[PDB]
TrEMBL record, chain A:
Name the record gives this protein: Uncharacterized protein
Organism per entry: Thermus thermophilus (strain ATCC 27634 / DSM 579 / HB8)
Length: 180, 161
C-alpha cells in the first residue's frame, strides 16, 4: 500500500443498478478465466507447503465461472478493451518469478474484496448477490494467502512491486468506471 | 487385455516394515502425478474442472500424509518408479482427452491392486468424464499406453516380491 490509487477507486461517482451491475458481472468472465489460468500457473511452481491454500482458491475461481455461466455469461464473446488490457496484465505477471506472482495474487483478491465492500450495498438483493460472487471461504483462504505472501514478500525488489501494484489499481479503476 | 490378471497374483511378501518402506518412496511418483494433474487443469474445459480440482486436492493431502510417515521429497528414486514417473511425463505430452482417460484409468488401477494385495465420488466424476471421452480416442494409442501403465504398476508391486 502505496498510496492514493485505492482511495481513488473508492471515490468513484458510481451508480449501482441491479441489471446494470449484473451485466458488469457477466462481462468479467474473460478475466475470471484468465485468473484461473494464472492460478494454475502458481500450482505448477507452488511448493508442497503452499499448495493447500492455492488449490482452495482455484476451487473458488472454478465455482465462480459456473455461477457466471448459469448467470448468462458466454466464454466466446468480444472483450471490452479495458478488460482485455487487464487480462494481459495477469498474463504479464504470469511471466514474473513465483514469489512475485503469489504476492500479487494475494493483492488482487484483497483489492477485489475492498472495492466490492465499498461500492456494493449490503442492504437488499445486493447482499444475496455478494453472497454468491464470493465463496464462503473466500476470506478464510485469503488469510492463508496473506500469510504466504507475507513471507514471500521478504526479499523482492519493492520498486518492482510498486509498478505492478500501481498498474493493478489502475486496471481496477478502469473496470469499475465502466459502471459510470 | 489380461495384464491386470498377472498383477493380481504376485505372491508378494506382505511384510509390514517392507510395505511402510514401499509406501515411503512413493512421494516422487505422487509428486509427478501432481504436476500431471496441474497439466490437466491447464487445458480442461470449465465443465471438467470441478472433479479435477477435487482430485488435485486429494493428491496434495496425500503428499502431506506421505510426509508424515517418513518419505523423503529429496531422495534417489528407485529406477522402476523413475521409469513410471517417465511414463506420466510422456503421457503428459499427449492430447487432453487421452490424459483424462489415462488419469482415470490410473486411479481405478491403483485402487484395484491396492484392494487385492493390501474420494470415491471424485472417482465417480472421473468415470463420467473419462467414459465420455473414451469414445473418439484412437484405440491403438490407448492400447500401447494402457499396456505401459499395467507393466509399470506390475513392476512397482513386484518390488514386494
Amino acid at each position: 500500500e502505496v498510496p492514493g490509487l485505492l482511495e481513488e477507486i473508492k471515490a468513484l461517482p458510481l451508480r449501482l443498478d441491479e441489471e446494470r451491475f449484473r451485466f458488469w458481472l457477466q462481462q468479467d468472465y474473460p478475466f475470471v478465466e484468465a485468473l484461473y489460468r494464472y492460478q494454475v500457473g502458481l500450482l505448477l511452481e507452488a511448493p508442497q507447503a503452499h499448495r493447500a491454500p492455492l488449490v482452495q482458491a482455484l476451487m473458488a475461481t472454478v465455482e465462480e465461472l459456473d455461477w457466471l455461466l448459469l448467470q448468462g455469461a458466454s466464454p466466446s464473446a468480444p472483450v471490452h478493451p479495458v478488460r482485455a488490457g487487464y487480462i494481459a496484465l495477469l498474463e504479464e505477471m504470469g511471466r514474473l518469478p513465483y514469489a512475485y506472482r503469489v504476492v500479487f495474487f494475494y493483492f488482487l483478491n484483497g483489492l477485489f474484496l475492498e472495492a466490492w465492500a465499498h461500492h456494493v450495498p449490503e442492504e437488499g438483493p445486493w447482499a444475496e448477490l455478494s453472497q454468491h460472487w464470493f465463496a464462503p471461504e473466500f476470506q478464510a483462504v485469503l488469510y492463508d494467502l496473506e500469510v504466504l505472501a507475507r513471507g514471500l514478500w521478504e526479499d523482492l525488489d519493492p520498486e518492482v512491486v510498486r509498478t505492478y501494484l500501481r498498474r493493478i489499481l489502475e486496471a481496477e479503476k478502469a473496470t469499475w468506471s465502466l459502471l459510470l
